[PDB]
Amino acid sequence: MKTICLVGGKLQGFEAAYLSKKAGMKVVLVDKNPQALIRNYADEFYCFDVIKEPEKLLELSKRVDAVLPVNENLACIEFLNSIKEKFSCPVLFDFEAYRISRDKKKSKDYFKSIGVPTPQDRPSKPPYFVKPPCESSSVGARIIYGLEPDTLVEEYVEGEVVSLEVVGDGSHFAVVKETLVHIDETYDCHMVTPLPANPLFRQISHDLAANLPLKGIMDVEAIFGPKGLRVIEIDARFPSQTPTVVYYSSGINLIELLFRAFTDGVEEIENKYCIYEHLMFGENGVLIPVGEQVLSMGSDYGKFYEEPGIEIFLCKGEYPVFTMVFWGKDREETGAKRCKGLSVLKERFGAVL
Ligand SMILES: Nc1ncnc2c1ncn2[C@@H]1O[C@H](COP(=O)(O)OP(=O)(O)NP(=O)(O)O)[C@@H](O)[C@H]1O
Ligand SMILES: Nc1ncnc2c1ncn2[C@@H]1O[C@H](COP(=O)(O)OP(=O)(O)OP(=O)(O)O)[C@@H](O)[C@H]1O
Ligand SMILES: NCCC[C@@H](N)C(=O)O
Ligand SMILES: [Mg+2]
Ligand SMILES: [Mg+2]
């Protein structure tokens, strides 16, 4: 049995934790927040700030197989970077890749320098898509029809949002599984589903990874626009939502793959279906789709229910949020499981959708 130590107890952390358990690893969580979201989901939980008490972490590091940072707190990351050489286990992170990826303008310079199409900056014609430079979860993302000098203003590119994760080991870059990112009115993601292979997207994602070169995990988001594919961002860190769907649809566990990238090495390159979504239990148990930004306001997050083809997790708080996962051999069965799941909530927990 392997033990993974996660630094970060929210959504990134949940996904890593969730996938570590499928790989049957013990999961140890470090988080500075006593009310860390997944605090009861992890096998062990140590509440401390790693910048304040680095020694506790280095110590943990003597007793785990790997440390995975799963937060986007730049102080935390830079700090981890400055002490990484002292861990007694691999640190499953690419810090240089993260440096380009967290800055959206920098990421766009990177796209351009390797010939990858990306929304045009500062167009004159409305609409403009505008969003902060270094956020995630689409915090601040907005359509427009006095921002900052550094706000990104882009052409609005209509069409589907699509995601691919790549795991690299520095030499080989394993492009995994395409997913469809369903967005809500806040440009947040409330649902993910898997897509058919897309070779162009796959080759672009390989090049992005290979020119770093990536050692660790990144995701590539693209919009399939009316004038072709446009990469809008990359995020070099363990993602939430999509790896679960990649797991059921493709059979690949990204935590497993990420762990191999820093040990064995990885090699390059199922076809089941999976639906993954968030639904807020609203007043009178009317169900409302919500994005990550809501789920992440929660107070406790753990497993609620499971039967074959159906997992349900409850994020407790100011209106509970349910994360549902359904899967099966094809869209049909999955849809059938989605129905059974909803009817579990409906008949037993008073829900209505
Ligand atoms: N130029 C654009 N045109 C149209 N929609 C866009 C554009 N840029 C971003 N979006 C939408 O807004 C969402 C958030 O933008 P994105 O640039 O992917 O970064 P992020 O906030 O750092 N989110 P993440 O993928 O969670 O880490 C995207 O998923 C798209 O749905
Ligand atoms: N230096 C640190 N030491 C320990 N845990 C940390 C540190 N920095 C962040 N975390 C934890 O990682 C998780 C995700 O942090 P991140 O900043 O990516 O998201 P966030 O939504 O901004 O978190 P927060 O609730 O603090 O705003 C949080 O639970 C946070 O407490
Ligand atoms: N890889 C696409 C996932 C988007 C969002 N859940 C995130 O972690 O950025
Ligand atoms: Mg992003
Ligand atoms: Mg994004």
UniProtKB/Swiss-Prot annotation:
Disulfide bonds: none annotated. The keyword Metal-binding applies. It comes from the Archaea. Pathway: Amino-acid biosynthesis; L-pyrrolysine biosynthesis. ADP binds at residues 104, 131, 138, 154-157, 233. ATP binds at residues 10, 31, 49-50, 72-73. PROSITE patterns: ATP_GRASP (PS50975). Mg(2+) 2 binds at residues 233, 235. Keywords: Amino-acid biosynthesis, ATP-binding, Ligase, Magnesium, Metal-binding, Nucleotide-binding. Pfam families: ATP-grasp_3 (PF02655), PylC-like_N (PF21360). It catalyses: (3R)-3-methyl-D-ornithine + L-lysine + ATP = (3R)-3-methyl-D-ornithyl-N(6)-L-lysine + ADP + phosphate + H(+). Mg(2+) 1 binds at residues 221, 233. L-lysine binds at residues 11-12, 72, 240, 292. Its cofactor is Mg(2+). D-ornithine binds at residues 163-165, 219, 237-242, 292. It is an enzyme of class 6 (ligase). One of its GO terms (molecular function) is ligase activity. Is required for the biosynthesis of pyrrolysine. Catalyzes the ATP-dependent ligation between (3R)-3-methyl-D-ornithine and L-lysine, leading to (3R)-3-methyl-D-ornithyl-N6-L-lysine. Contains two adenine nucleotides bound at the active site. One ATP molecule is involved in catalysis, the second adenine nucleotide functions as a selective anchor for the C- and N-terminus of the Lys substrate and is responsible for protein stability. NCBIfam families: pyrrolys_PylC. This is 3-methyl-D-ornithine--L-lysine ligase.
